[PDB]
Amino acid sequence: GHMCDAFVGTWKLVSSENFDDYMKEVGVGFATRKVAGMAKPNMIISVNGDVITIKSESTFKNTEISFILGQEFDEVTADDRKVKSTITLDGGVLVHVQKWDGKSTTIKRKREDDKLVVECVMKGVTSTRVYERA
Numbered sequence: 851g852h853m854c855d856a857f858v859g860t861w862k863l864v865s866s867e868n869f870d871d872y873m874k875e876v877g878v879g880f881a882t883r884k885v886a887g888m889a890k891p892n893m894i895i896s897v898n899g900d901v902i903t904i905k906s907e908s909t910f911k912n913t914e915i916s917f918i919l920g921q922e923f924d925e926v927t928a929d930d931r932k933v934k935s936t937i938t939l940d941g942g943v944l945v946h947v948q949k950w951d952g953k954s955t956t957i958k959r960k961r962e963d964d965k966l967v968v969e970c971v972m973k974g975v976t977s978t979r980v981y982e983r984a
């Protein structure tokens with residue numbers, strides 16, 4: 851249960867690039883996009899045996915996903931998509947693919963320097979969000 855040791859802890863947002871464009875490509879509505887952009891999320895990543903939990907906390911929406919690496923699971927995203935999600939550990943990076951409605955998006959959670967970087971890709975649009983330890 852050590853696969854994820856470099857990710858565990860609490861994290862807070864430093865910077866965001868192209869996040870609104872990413873949500874646009876995903877199909878998120880205007881009001882939800884504006885709420886999401888205003889959020890200052892606190893992210894908690896924790897491990898309990900084989901089960902990893904990623905929690906995002908913000909004033910107006912929390913999400914929590916718990917999963918086993920490599921095991922597909924049902925996720926209801928913050929924008930209310932019902933997706934089939936699989937997260938694997940590849941080259942020290944958590945690679946999260948969401949599949950729904952004939953579409954897919956990939957969320958990579960990686961370490962760079964002392965930061966946790968979240969890279970989200972939808973049809974060639976990439977958002978990069980940088981977190982520092984809380």
Ligand SMILES: O=C(O)C(F)(F)C(F)(F)C(F)(F)C(F)(F)C(F)(F)C(F)(F)C(F)(F)C(F)(F)C(F)(F)F
Pocket residue numbers: 873878882883886891893906911927928929930957968969970979
């Ligand atoms: O900052 C992070 O923790 C993050 F980068 F990991 C993340 F949270 F942004 C994400 F990757 F999970 C995400 F982009 F997919 C997302 F969950 F936010 C979303 F953009 F897909 C979303 F649309 F669901 C929304 F922004 F939360 C919504 F618009 F619904 F509020």
